[PDB]
Amino acid sequence: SGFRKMAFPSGKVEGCMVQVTCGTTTLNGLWLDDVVYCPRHVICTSEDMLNPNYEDLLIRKSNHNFLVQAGNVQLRVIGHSMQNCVLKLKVDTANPKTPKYKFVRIQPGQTFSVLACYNGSPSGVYQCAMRPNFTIKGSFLNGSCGSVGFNIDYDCVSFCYMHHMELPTGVHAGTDLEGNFYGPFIDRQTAQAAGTDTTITVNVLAWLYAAVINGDRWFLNRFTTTLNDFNLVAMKYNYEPLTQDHVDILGPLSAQTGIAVLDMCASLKELLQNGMNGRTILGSALLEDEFTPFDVVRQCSGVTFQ
Amino acid sequence: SGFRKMAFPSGKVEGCMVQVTCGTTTLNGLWLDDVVYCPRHVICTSEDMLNPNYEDLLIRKSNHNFLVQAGNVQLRVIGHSMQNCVLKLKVDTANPKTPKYKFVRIQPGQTFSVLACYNGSPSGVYQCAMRPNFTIKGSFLNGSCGSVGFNIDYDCVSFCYMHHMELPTGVHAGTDLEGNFYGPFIDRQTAQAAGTDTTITVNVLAWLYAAVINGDRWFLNRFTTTLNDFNLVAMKYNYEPLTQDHVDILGPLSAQTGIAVLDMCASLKELLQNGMNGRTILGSALLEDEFTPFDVVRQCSGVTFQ
Ligand SMILES: *C(=N)[C@H](C[C@@H]1CCNC1=O)NC(=O)[C@@H]1Cc2ccccc2CN1C(=O)[C@@H](NC(=O)C(F)(F)F)C(C)(C)C
Ligand SMILES: *C(=N)[C@H](C[C@@H]1CCNC1=O)NC(=O)[C@@H]1Cc2ccccc2CN1C(=O)[C@@H](NC(=O)C(F)(F)F)C(C)(C)C
Ligand SMILES: [K+]
Ligand SMILES: [K+]
């Protein structure tokens, strides 16, 4: 029993973290085979942050201008190139701890683990979601850029995020591992800000099912609703629309508990219209939307990774 | 910016997890040098759970009756012995990924990371606290026993918990790595239940400081209090007494923010007497007590591990 915000084991990713230094700036890079991937803004200086001309800054740097360290060992850079908002530093040594891996671009509403790193060394791991507004609610300080997010399936690490920027509310923006930003954001010090976020409805439902599996059932009512009527209430409270694909994705949790998704929706509608009145669900006084259905099943069935 | 329930990188511990099978039961063990440590109840059967006679069950088992698997490779057991509530299985191979490590018995109020495992393979990592009532609010299913909790300092893994039991409210009980239970609990299927818990006050204060560092300041009032007056309010709301040692442990966070601990206490007293009135602190509608001062400083300063 119990339910925690659970991260993936980080070991496969830890063996890939290195330090990249270019002049003043040090941040983190990801060493896979003989390539280190890092944020291109490692080549910037404090002045040229308003509008960096990345091609112009880069043509002034040669291989030796990138200092790349894997713990105590220096990795010699023998090539470099820019792809979108990342640098690929070809090094003379293939990483012997490269895991089986894929680069994936995740969808809003999906979750992943972040291995927060400073100077190439890991600080901690936590779980996050790609918000509908293409930000993530992370925990990141100066020097954290190049830290990655990832999922593990079986034996394969799927890298989906690299950290670049912090936006005004203290939320975070970054790229996939091809260097394309999630959302409208760019690596410039400008006025950009996050769009208005929404609450990931299918995930809230998943978490209500998680509550039920753990014996926390007080919020279940005797009513049902239609999908259309549910979605009218959801819009009012700034919840995403629930689609039939969402309903079907929730099928396994509905089956385990014997609670039809639309019945669960009627209970969610009541929680949104009436509040929780001092009560908690899985130790929380708010509805939680950063567990996906798959996350709930993994945790409540004991799924492991090779 | 930002603040998350952050776990330690798990890689050093992942390389120590193995599977132990004895007849019907499979659970997890911790492979350090040429010793595998696991819960002694691996030698039990479904009937003899009310009152196992562990010495009698064990004398009927020889080395070959313990099947120990490190991923795909079988580890031959060449000795076995019982220490308190754990078995130590001497194996013919020293683990080549043994990290620098220590066995520590933590204090109530302290936090650690759990690497939840099934069949020797990791499922996820999350952060927990040793509750004042010597339980932990974990997430554990059948087969999770032998999963460990730990802290990382510099390059040294300090193992502090191994998982054995689930108590009636869905909370968890286990031992240190010498096989002594935390709390009054034992490895028997009996009526045992957890004492009444309390809220870890110094930790709540640490987390309020974490809020302030991140710009979430609305709960700070203009008042102060004495330590004795604060502790009268704390008792009423089932909070532990705050000691002068606690006050001094909070010194670094008080210094960074410029908020005297007793001033912060006056703000906490107001939150306990008046509630939050629909507001949140660091995204939470409840006060959080599973961050220690040290956890807050690590996260808000970027501490890394070798
Ligand atoms: C990575 N090391 C660091 C991570 C930030 C630091 C504080 N918390 C974080 O998460 N990245 C930056 O500081 C980036 C780098 C950069 C590249 C090109 C142009 C400008 C910058 C400045 N950075 C910012 O994150 C800034 N944010 C923004 O400019 C915006 F809000 F996104 F527009 C700022 C946090 C104001 C330094
Ligand atoms: C470890 N594999 C497993 C972890 C439990 C299973 C469900 N969730 C968990 O965290 N451990 C057990 O099930 C133990 C083992 C044991 C050893 C000796 C005697 C009896 C048992 C039965 N176990 C329990 O956890 C049981 N709890 C209690 O008996 C008590 F509440 F602590 F008294 C029970 C959860 C009822 C199976
Ligand atoms: K240009
Ligand atoms: K005995």
UniProtKB/Swiss-Prot annotation, chains A, B:
Q: How is its activity regulated?
A: Inhibited by pyridone-containing alpha-ketoamides compounds 13a and 13b. In turn, alpha-ketoamide 13b (tert-butyl (1-((S)-1-(((S)-4-(benzylamino)-3,4-dioxo-1-((S)-2-oxopyrrolidin-3-yl)butan-2-yl)amino)-3-cyclopropyl-1-oxopropan-2-yl)-2-oxo-1,2-dihydropyridin-3-yl)carbamate) inhibits SARS-CoV-2 replication in human lung cells. Inhibited ex vivo by michael acceptor inhibitor N3. Inhibited ex vivo by compound 11a and 11b.
* Domain Peptidase C30 residues, every copy: 1-306
State where the protein is found.
Answer: Host cytoplasm; Host Golgi apparatus; Host nucleus
Q: What's the reported outcome of changing L205V? A: In strain: Zeta/P.2
Looking at the record's lineage, which domain of life comes first? Viruses
Q: What chemistry does it catalyse, as a reaction equation?
A: TSAVLQ-|-SGFRK-NH2 and SGVTFQ-|-GKFKK the two peptides corresponding to the two self-cleavage sites of the SARS 3C-like proteinase are the two most reactive peptide substrates. The enzyme exhibits a strong preference for substrates containing Gln at P1 position and Leu at P2 position
Active site, renumbered = H41 (for 3cl-pro activity), C145 (nucleophile)
Cross-link named Glycyl lysine isopeptide (Lys-Gly) (interchain with G-Cter in ubiquitin), sites? K5, K90
Upon changing M49A, the result is:
Does not affect ability to cleave and inactivate human TRMT1
Q: Show which residues sit on the Cytoplasmic side of the membrane.
A: 1-306
Q: Subunit structure, per the record?
A: 3CL-PRO exists as monomer and homodimer. Only the homodimer shows catalytic activity. Interacts with host FBXO22; this interaction promotes the proteasomal degradation of nsp5.
Task: Give a short account of what the protein does.
Answer: Cleaves the C-terminus of replicase polyprotein at 11 sites. Recognizes substrates containing the core sequence [ILMVF]-Q-|-[SGACN]. Cleaves and inactivates human TRMT1, preventing tRNA guanine(26)-dimethylation of tRNAs. May cleave human NLRP1 in lung epithelial cells, thereby activating the NLRP1 inflammasome pathway. May cleave human GSDMD, triggering alternative GSDME-mediated epithelial cell death upon activation of the NLRP1 inflammasome, which may enhance the release interleukins 1B, 6, 16 and 18. Also able to bind an ADP-ribose-1''-phosphate (ADRP).
Q: What is this protein called?
A: 3C-like proteinase nsp5
Q: What species is given as this protein's source?
A: Severe acute respiratory syndrome coronavirus 2
Classification of source organism? Viruses, Riboviria, Orthornavirae, Pisuviricota, Pisoniviricetes
Q: From which residue to which, out of the full length, is covered? A: 3264 to 3569 of 7096
